[PDB]
Amino acid sequence: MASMERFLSVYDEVQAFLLDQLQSKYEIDPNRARYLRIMMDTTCLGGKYFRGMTVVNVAEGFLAVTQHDEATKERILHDACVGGWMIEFLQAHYLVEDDIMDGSVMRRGKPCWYRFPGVTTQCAINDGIILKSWTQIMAWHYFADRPFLKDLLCLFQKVDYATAVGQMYDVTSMCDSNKLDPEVAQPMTTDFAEFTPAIYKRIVKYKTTFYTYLLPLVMGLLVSEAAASVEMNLVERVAHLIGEYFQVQDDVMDCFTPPEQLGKVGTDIEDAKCSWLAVTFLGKANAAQVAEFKANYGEKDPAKVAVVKRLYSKANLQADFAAYEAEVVREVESLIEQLKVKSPTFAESVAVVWEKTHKR
Amino acid sequence: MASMERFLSVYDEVQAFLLDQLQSKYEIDPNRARYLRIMMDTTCLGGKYFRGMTVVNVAEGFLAVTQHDEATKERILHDACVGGWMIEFLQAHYLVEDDIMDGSVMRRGKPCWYRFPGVTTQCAINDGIILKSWTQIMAWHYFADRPFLKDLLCLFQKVDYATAVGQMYDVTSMCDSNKLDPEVAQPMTTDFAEFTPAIYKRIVKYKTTFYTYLLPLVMGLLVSEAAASVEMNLVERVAHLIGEYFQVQDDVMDCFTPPEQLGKVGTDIEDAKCSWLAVTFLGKANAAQVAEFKANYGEKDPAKVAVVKRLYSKANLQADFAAYEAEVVREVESLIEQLKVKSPTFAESVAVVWEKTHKR
């Protein structure tokens, strides 16, 4: 955790850079500077730093096998940290805005940012916008002269857009596609015909995998000037696979993990989310159980939510999860083997990403 | 309006490009594609296209005095149009999100996008995010090989951030700065001590001037490969000046222009906005009128709103507006004269921007 230390120190630097700039070029006053400092901390700190630290880890692995001056080593580690915080702030953006979109109450055992008394939705929507603009201000400042600037900005931009499209797939996942119409209020599906594996996979791929796995791995390659070292179709396939697994864990926990341990009260049932539980349950239920699911899903009534949870328990979805978990393990190993050929170093970083995902 | 024709045709092209890409690379289905096509149209079309057309006009003026192959002329005009739509979509982003932030009802005589029955705030916040990501997707696609790419992206990014910071200054403009605290619900100011010219100028500079005037003028220079033709401090000063004037018109109309002609019911009074009317009124009112303003401002009660409007009328703010209007005219002329030296062509484009602002 020398690595973590360096990561968290660069946070303080980037924060001081951003706030200093607000004063020198944006005419900000101290009280507004303090409000943003607080906003930044509250929204960007307190997680595990998985996405940002992956950039750092990928760069550290290349540093162990690549010849450089010390000053160059330090520059590469600094860039990996700044790149990691670009991802963290991008995540922060999306969590602030998603929490508002969904009317969420808590995140990480603390209230959602919009719910803070002196924030409100009015300021919070803009605060999220600020979060994401800070990523660009970081990039243009710290990476102005870097040969990877263009590639890094273009990647970032595509990942951002993927994530927004994924959010659209998510927010629309309980509607019937043939009924989407801005002019007409959308009913919740009655047939659940679109609660399929292929459809779930589409949501998760765009909404999470791009920003959580693809971006930190490819950013670590880009700040290392190492991208031609790997087969980018392979990196993409392994990110999309690990990414899917990660969300299937999150889906299971939303239902079954105690709220104090989850950091929030899960509401995927009431929200009629296209979860791995729902999709899996529908792939194996009999006619009477499908009917009972339809009568009870997507409803705030706790009585009906508890009917859903009992259908899940009875249907033995733990056996489906274990089968899934074993197959993802096969596939992740296969892809690591394919990466080992070209870059053993990069394959080991992917192995570590997978280990941290698989046993969290 | 050959110019306008070309501008609006490039819209259809860019829309087809974006939706086609969503299908080929983002696994979108037709119904979701149609929802976004509708979103794009509703949020991006129906204004005057002032900001986008300024990019086109600035480029057309350089085309009239610069030697190029026909194919090059067409490429420059195409780039100016695509750049203009980047600004329009950036505007669309901000209007969707601001309308949600403020709980607005109507914009341009039609409901705010979030209020459409099949949209809702949940989808609308993300739709706005999409709007702004489309600007980047346009830029990277159409300008991939362009020597101005870097300069254009860096400018865009700084203007975006300026606009977000300006939105923060705006949303916080009725709070006492020394009281801003995310932990504490914010009371409306009781002293109106921060309703000053310098403070109003700070809001308007960041919130509007950057994206409405600076960005279209400098973008037109950048797609023309003409930026070293001008003194950029001068371009900045004239944009900030015209920009301020534009917002002072908007402030006056919010109060006095009939709602059917305004396209919305103005609520700056009820919202306790730091308007040019409020600031000007406070710069000339006597003690009894300041007290009466304080008793009635920032309150939805129509009785109290009509007390505010009568204090404004009695205080003869039309004389202040005319003095202001005459002084901005002096200053805008001065700056045009300074620009005429280096670029007469660019000075004429600024003249046209000012004429369209001054007599709207």
Ligand SMILES: O=C(Nc1ccc2ncccc2c1)c1ccccc1
């Ligand atoms: O906590 C640790 N470092 C920091 C450093 C800078 C911070 N700045 C702001 C907020 C939190 C920070 C935390 C740490 C790192 C490695 C091993 C043990 C501890």
Ligand SMILES: O=C(Nc1ccc2ncccc2c1)c1ccccc1
């Ligand atoms: O930590 C690092 N740089 C800095 C620099 C100036 C700071 N000022 C205030 C607060 C924190 C600061 C951190 C660093 C350096 C090289 C490689 C990786 C990290």
Ligand SMILES: O=C(Nc1ccc2ncccc2c1)c1ccccc1
């Ligand atoms: O990939 C998924 N299921 C699979 C695929 C292949 C398997 N092969 C062997 C054993 C179990 C398997 C499970 C899946 C299903 C629903 C939603 C998301 C993902």
Ligand SMILES: O=C(Nc1ccc2ncccc2c1)c1ccccc1
């Ligand atoms: O209205 C005009 N042009 C267009 C062109 C393409 C459009 N595509 C989508 C939506 C609206 C469009 C409008 C026009 C332009 C110049 C002189 C007169 C008329």
Ligand SMILES: O=C(Nc1ccc2ncccc2c1)c1ccccc1
């Ligand atoms: O209008 C222009 N291009 C296009 C190209 C393909 C289109 N496809 C569908 C719809 C509209 C299209 C417009 C254009 C060309 C040069 C200079 C400026 C503008």
Ligand SMILES: O=C(Nc1ccc2ncccc2c1)c1ccccc1
């Ligand atoms: O610039 C502003 N007022 C000025 C400045 C100088 C003038 N010189 C002569 C006559 C009228 C003048 C008016 C202003 C005031 C409040 C809010 C925003 C702007």
Ligand SMILES: [Zn+2]
């Ligand atoms: Zn959500």
Ligand SMILES: [Zn+2]
């Ligand atoms: Zn979840």
Ligand SMILES: [Zn+2]
């Ligand atoms: Zn607003």
Ligand SMILES: [Zn+2]
């Ligand atoms: Zn207004």
